[PDB]
Design an enzyme around this catalytic site. Structure first.
Site, PDB file in Angstrom:
ATOM      1  N   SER A  90     -62.014 -19.753  73.186  1.00  0.00           N
ATOM      2  CA  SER A  90     -62.263 -19.567  71.767  1.00  0.00           C
ATOM      3  C   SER A  90     -62.151 -20.906  71.052  1.00  0.00           C
ATOM      4  O   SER A  90     -61.258 -21.700  71.353  1.00  0.00           O
ATOM      5  CB  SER A  90     -61.260 -18.574  71.190  1.00  0.00           C
ATOM      6  N   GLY A  91     -63.061 -21.162  70.115  1.00  0.00           N
ATOM      7  CA  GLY A  91     -63.036 -22.424  69.388  1.00  0.00           C
ATOM      8  C   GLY A  91     -61.876 -22.487  68.418  1.00  0.00           C
ATOM      9  O   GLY A  91     -60.968 -23.291  68.585  1.00  0.00           O
ATOM     10  N   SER A  92     -61.922 -21.622  67.412  1.00  0.00           N
ATOM     11  CA  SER A  92     -60.897 -21.517  66.388  1.00  0.00           C
ATOM     12  C   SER A  92     -59.475 -21.509  66.967  1.00  0.00           C
ATOM     13  O   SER A  92     -58.538 -22.012  66.362  1.00  0.00           O
ATOM     14  CB  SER A  92     -61.132 -20.230  65.595  1.00  0.00           C
ATOM     15  N   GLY A 237     -66.340 -20.048  65.166  1.00  0.00           N
ATOM     16  CA  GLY A 237     -65.702 -20.563  66.368  1.00  0.00           C
ATOM     17  C   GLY A 237     -66.679 -20.791  67.516  1.00  0.00           C
ATOM     18  O   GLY A 237     -67.551 -21.660  67.433  1.00  0.00           O
ATOM     19  N   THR A 238     -66.528 -20.007  68.586  1.00  0.00           N
ATOM     20  CA  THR A 238     -67.392 -20.093  69.764  1.00  0.00           C
ATOM     21  C   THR A 238     -68.792 -19.577  69.444  1.00  0.00           C
ATOM     22  O   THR A 238     -69.703 -19.655  70.273  1.00  0.00           O
ATOM     23  CB  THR A 238     -66.832 -19.259  70.932  1.00  0.00           C
TER      24      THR A 238
END
Lengths: 311, 311
Positions: A90-92, A237-238
């Protein structure tokens, strides 16, 4: 008061998206690899329900768990636990975990820059922290190799008519669909989603990921030079890492181009390079964002509490 | 307020001796084994001074750090950090660590009994918890193999006259000396120790440990069946395993006999079995004691604070 357990969490959000982190109280899940551990967390459900569900955490909340690295070249490993599932990356959250580490002191903060090597479920991730005055200002993460599975493929939606969509993966499985071919998106989202698992069957050439997790209704992206701004929506995010994979599979974004995700604060990201993953083209995303710690807490559970898993 | 780091500790004492435990905030020390990790903690000193020293922790305080197991058969590893040194194994602390694990929920508490396998610096340790009503009542630990190095050996003490003493190891290196051959003790304590490091130069056939950590002054022990009760002063827990080893090397104690150490809440012990180690005989100490949790805490450190290591 009495409790049957205590987890210590340090609260943290990145550009708005909550990404709380568990620093202690929780023993590393069983499994020889991180990947398997996250799986266990997803199957068991005991941990995710305790922290995610109320009365401890309102809906739409994230919480990452730090785990002993299983890869030689990795200072720390973690598992992402989204209110819906446990994604491979996950980005965030890879941002919050990066931040907590530095702001909490778990990792040595070097100024003006500090380089870490974290290990999410999907694989190792390079991180570049911009620390200044004893605080990680901005976090830049090299997400796992992202890619687009299907592109412009028909989709028999029982909803109305037939539309073409594209499936990608930038930390999680998505099915991108232009809101043009759509004409409440939440309902139509659940629909277009399930339909994709049926008609298109997703597959990752390096992880036991075998499905399309979500669907994001996108709009035409504008260009201001090398910075593409898009008002896409499922959160972010992603999300972008995946879209860029497709945007790059349609010649709408070349290597070295920075993509700016809608302002859920605009999540930045750039296509570092192009890599070949499992006999296929792939991009090396560079998500970056700003995360602030929100505090610390110790969650507990009374044995006579009727909601051990939380409602 | 501002901090440069945050460690989360759960406070715990065993029969009076404090044995606080660090559950989060601290990354596992560098090293391929637990042993080496504890060493690092001892050399670096940065961590031990932060938690042990004031203004965070008064003198005579202990604090154990949980670390990812490095031994296949071990649910959790830890390092003991005594105000004086980082011993390879501590009784009073192996009890607190065992307790925190269960009362904090890190480990699954089985009633009426639960079996753990912890890993201290010195080696693996079997633990038998007596849990009742969601609380570890009593903790029984199978300390590492203990033994007696020298027995009745002359000792040139610059203090006064010459006396005979015995050196043993039951989690730590000790030099036992009857207060009879002494005729205050605290002052003549560190004095008789140095002599031992000189005239008797200790060595453990499995660990880097090669010196006498402390000195304990004892008097005759009484018997009331199979339970030997004795007075000792030097750190009473790890002292017992050392004593029994000697009492056993002199015929004053046999397998299956219980040993109750002076209540500095009398610390119980038993000589489970007799094993061989490094070519010489040895005993399998079984320490037992009750511990409670005093609470939880998160230590911090302001950058402008003139005492980063504490005074």
């Amino acid at each position: 008061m009495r409790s049957t357990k205590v987890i210590h969490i340090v609260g943290c959000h990145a550009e708005g998206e909550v990404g709380d982190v568990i620093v202690g109280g929780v023993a590393p899940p069983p499994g020889e690899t991180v990947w398997e551990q996250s799986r266990f967390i997803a199957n068991d459900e005991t941990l995710r329900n305790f922290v995610l569900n109320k009365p401890r955490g309102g809906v739409f909340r994230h919480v990452n768990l730090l785990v002993p690295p299983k890869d030689p070249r990795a200072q720390m490993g973690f598992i992402i636990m989204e209110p819906a599932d446990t994604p491979p990356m996950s980005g965030s959250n890879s941002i919050c975990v990066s931040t907590v580490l530095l702001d909490s002191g778990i990792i040595a903060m070097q100024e003006p820059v500090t380089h870490m090597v974290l290990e999410a479920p999907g694989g190792i991730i390079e991180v570049e922290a911009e620390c200044r005055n004893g605080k990680a200002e901005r976090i830049s993460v090299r997400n796992v190799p992202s890619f687009a599975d299907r592109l412009d493929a028909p989709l028999d939606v029982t909803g109305l008519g037939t539309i073409m969509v594209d499936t990608a993966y930038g930390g999680d499985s998505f099915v991108i669909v232009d809101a043009a071919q759509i004409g409440e998106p939440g309902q139509a989202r659940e629909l277009a989603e399930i339909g994709v698992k049926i008609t298109k069957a997703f597959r990752h050439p390096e992880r036991d990921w075998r499905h399309i997790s979500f669907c994001q209704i996108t709009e035409p992206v504008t260009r201001e030079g090398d910075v593409l701004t898009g008002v896409n929506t499922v959160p972010t995010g992603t999300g972008c890492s995946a879209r860029m994979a497709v945007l790059h599979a349609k010649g709408q974004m070349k290597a070295g181009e920075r993509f700016i995700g809608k302002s859920v604060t605009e999540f930045h990201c750039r296509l570092d390079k192009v890599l070949e993953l499992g006999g296929k083209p792939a991009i090396s995303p560079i998500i970056s964002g700003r995360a602030w710690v929100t505090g610390t807490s110790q969650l507990m559970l009374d044995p006579s509490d009727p909601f051990p898993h939380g409602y």
